[PDB]
């Protein structure tokens with residue numbers, strides 16, 4: 394369904410009650426992003442979200458509240474140099490649903506090492522638009538729309 398070259402994907406914005414969001418550092422790199430990942434066949438976006446929430450951040454439902462979610466896809470294109478044309482299903486980009494999670498269990502529960510090959514090796518609380526300012530350029534349009542979609546809810550926690 395909707396085989397359009399864009400891989401179904403779900404991203405996570407974790408917030409606290411001070412208008413900050415959790416920013417994660419890609420393993421062995423100095424680039425940062427929100428947790429994201431593919432939605433597997435048969436999974437709802439919410440189910441994929443909770444799976445990657447634990448795989449990438451070590452958090453489960455008891456640690457968070459889903460405050461909001463986006464209903465429609467936000468799409469971004471890979472840089473042409475990064476497209477893998479011989480690996481099916483070929484994707485030229487990702488189409489993302491996004492979830493807004495309040496962390497309610499405390500910072501110590503974040504655990505990015507639930508695997509021997511972790512996605513991330515560090516995290517920071519950052520100001521609300523800092524992800525828009527710092528994310529790789531080809532995700533910036535999506536990040537703007539995600540953060541704006543979630544802004545009123547995040548502010549309501551302060």
Ligand SMILES: Nc1nc2c(ncn2[C@@H]2O[C@H](COP(=O)(O)OP(=O)(O)OP(=O)(O)O)[C@@H](O)[C@H]2O)c(=O)[nH]1
Pocket residue numbers: 402424425426429430431471475487528529
């Ligand atoms: N230099 C640089 N490259 C990035 C950055 N983020 C993603 N990339 C590269 O862009 C390509 C696409 O990245 P993503 O769209 O995040 O997809 P992915 O990480 O391969 O797959 P998922 O984590 O499952 O969503 C990957 O090959 C990354 O190496 C970044 O912040 N800096």
